[model samples]
Target: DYVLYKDATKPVEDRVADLLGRMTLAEKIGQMTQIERLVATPDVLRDNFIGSLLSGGGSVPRKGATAKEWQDMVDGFQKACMSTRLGIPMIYGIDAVHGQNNVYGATIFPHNVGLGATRDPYLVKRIGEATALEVRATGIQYAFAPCIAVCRDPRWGRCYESYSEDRRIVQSMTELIPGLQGDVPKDFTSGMPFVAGKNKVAACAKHFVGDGGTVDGINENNTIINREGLMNIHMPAYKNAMDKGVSTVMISYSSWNGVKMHANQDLVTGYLKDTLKFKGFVISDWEGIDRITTPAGSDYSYSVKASILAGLDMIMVPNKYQQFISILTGHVNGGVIPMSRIDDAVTRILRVKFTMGLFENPYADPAMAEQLGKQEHRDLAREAARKSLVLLKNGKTSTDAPLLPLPKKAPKILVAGSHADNLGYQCGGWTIEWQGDTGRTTVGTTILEAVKAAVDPSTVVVFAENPDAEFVKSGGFSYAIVAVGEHPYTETKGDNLNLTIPEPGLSTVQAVCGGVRCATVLISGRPVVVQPLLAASDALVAAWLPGSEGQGVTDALFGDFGFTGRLPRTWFKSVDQLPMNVGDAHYDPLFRLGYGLTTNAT
Candidate 1:
């Protein structure tokens, strides 16, 4: 190719410069706009010079669409962009936070909270690699993932997405960045975007700054902290993510002190870009600019100006993207927004595209679709599920023998709880559906199925969503396995001031465990009220949303594997001690952060 940008051998910066010089104002604005998939028609794409398309949580091409369908959909989008005058390949993005979650039949790994309990950076990294392959298979070049929010409060609905309240543990888990984007080579520039090959997807270190430390963990509330506090708690992971060459940073919806993060120039431009030297582009969250004003969408013109001038590179407009473009163009024409700022944003966006090898290879690989939901990745997820289980109350007292390592050869066994047979609850938010779903929402082993598979063939397994104590006594069951916890939730819906083990699950715990020796497995995103269940059960384990591989739960329960998970968040006795952490002076915990009982594989 005679074109410098088209030449794969040319340096990324040189290609970006060549492309930037050739782009018109319309094309430059398109590079900054990220529209939702529904509006991404071939005509809309070429006519608008659209830069990117994204699937919001649960936004699939169709219900239960397979990898082939996904590849087909993305390639069609790429085809349109390729027809444009300059032919800048548009990047597709999705929230593959766990596995390639949005696609059906893709292996779902344990959510971040569960992975955090493992305290195994290398293991988290492996999960990252597996997740990347699954995502790459679908034709997505960018992943809106590795949310490095240091969740300070469980009351915060997105807590499970966070690895730990401790900055150290959260920082350690940033190993996921390298796993998703491939390892940086010797000459790789720090903070520059890097995706080693087609198997890799550019990883995003999300909600940049602080979404996890919101007041009482409120979804989009303000975070009132000193600069030192902010830098110490929430800022450490971004440093680690950038060092690993994270491709993008998504701005948080939450505000720092009194200012909205989307409009904060001090942090976004001054700190992240200039001081920290994060060369990757900063993206606004979905409709993030509208949120800058209290009433929202009140002044579109102002939001467009404020956010852009604040150093935001890309807008997840997902909007009547036309309105955004007109307003943004008006600002540039009015001279309120400088051309240099536009160039900077376009340069970063083009840099990522060029570095990703998109110009030479813009279309999805039909063969990569085979990588979806393969046994090898599922096995990795199974191992993750095993290590993610935190044993909170393994025994009633010091003298009592633990109930786990249950006799798989028992004549009879009982499985009961809200989550026992349900696949949706097992894999929490950011799954195939946003905020997740219930029942056989997707393919995967339920805990009940896993229990059945792990036991001796001769053993009879009784199934009940909630069995009475009298039934437990009369049924002649050797022991009970009670799986129960919070249902799928994320963002605003997940925020709960009162953290309690929901309805049927709490009742099931009392009924089944009361009648016989039992191990109560709490399937939740974070520590819910376990005081009542602790009193009722012979043993208790925190299986924080184990995803599809429920066999991991049975494997550890039946002694095929050891229990190695530790508490990533402190278990509060009640919500009275709202914002408690490990290092707090008056720390009183049901189970302290990092607390877990170990069991050897038999």
Candidate 2:
């Protein structure tokens, strides 16, 4: 006689109910704790009754692990999970934000900043499906992606993670939810979580509420917006995510007014659960609970009590699970944290696990591992890259017409700048590693390679990391192409108060343009102060972090495709015009949102 939860034929609710009733307090608390893979062991999962495991950015089995290695490693963990008394399958998760980004040689798509500029939800959805396939290829069942942050300020370090500044844009891009979790079921109603098939992994809408609206655009800083402002600006995207039935919502590390989001029951439990009626479990950001107190870890016991009661369904404990488990157990046994809350949290976790079909099929589909970094996905990424290029300037002189579609048959051309031949510079942050690496960190065509490929075979091409004015003039180059912009960065390190194009890039721009006719292609995650560099170029293009597909940049620049991307965020004239947006009280920008120019294809 098997348990109801053990019978795959039974309805999910009955199974969940039967399991919930059977679980002890320890089992329930274990299900609510998520630990990192580094600290996870078979005994830990078996003895501690661990329910979930995750790989943080750059956290892989080994550097450059193959898809088979990933599947094998995760399957090894799954086997540990199966050895448990209940045999509740553990779900594996990764930050496959762009495209299973943690996996080596995976097809990395443009970051959300570029995707937002495309303004094509269908394309974004396709990217989501591709991302899901790549994530699944690694045997991971959930992805903490489709950030859906309505970034009001570009100064935020995670601005590249947001789709757009406009709420409507962010709302529309929620199409990603369906792309990741399978399409919304024909009979699906709002506030119910859904993931269609094995191909689709669970999707997450993250940093819940007002993480993107913090003052000074600080990471994990308090968002001072009032209820009206919050609802109008930051809240609508969640409504869309919930409506689309996103499986999870990750709580922001930031706060509402001054209350830590981890402790804001009014929003996490009240607004999200009761008012919006979000059905999915709410998980915390990385190490989110520990920082709930000022100076962090002031009192672990208080932090645990405050966060659990405040409505965090699952804690991303990351490490030291024994301490967390011990603390949570004490709270429940002492009645400091109610049994009801623990039941609710475990119920949600099991619900997700059941809905994801982890019980019936807990192991990875080893066949799908071969699909990692396939060429078809790279082609799709290239298409996305071309669509994300925002043309800011065509020519320095109005009467000079456009300098783009440079004659492929030209005698010679000069390609120069910090990013021109560098693959690391083009891919930006969140590639194979967390903060992202430099100097051929991964394989991809650099802008220089792409440009060399685009022109006639008979044409000569010269390259320079930073050419002097003397070199440029003496070469008698038919034209010059300068690829320069911000180097790779992520989170706290990326935040800037006086955003400007850094040197030798600034100097490279002046030197190249002073000597020959050229177009300056700015490769960056967000708009940097470029007013000083603008005057020196014959043409300008914002290739906002074009990921692994440098060929797409050449496709547009060399006339195979024309510029179609529009600005998703305002390009400020200077940092002094900080917070300047489309409808600001003092609106002024170098280029307004939705601004882009087209070119005539040859």
Computed on alpha carbons, the lDDT of every model, listed in order, comes to 0.91, 0.88
Candidate 2: segments with Cα more than 4 A from true spot: none
Instruction: Indicate the worst ten consecutive residues by lDDT in candidate 1.
Output: 501-510
Top model number, lDDT: 1
Q: Cα RMSD to native, each candidate?
A: 0.9, 1.1
TM per prediction: 0.99, 0.99
153: Cα error in model 2, Å: 1.8
- lDDT per residue as tens, model 2, 313-344: 88999898999999999988898998999988
Candidate 2, clashing residue pairs?
Answer: none
What would you estimate as the lDDT of candidate 2? 0.88
Q: RMSD of candidate 1 to the true fold?
A: 0.9
The residue pairs that clash in candidate 1, if any, are none
lDDT for each residue of candidate 1 in 330-364, tens digit (9 for 90 to 100): 99999999999999999999988888788878988
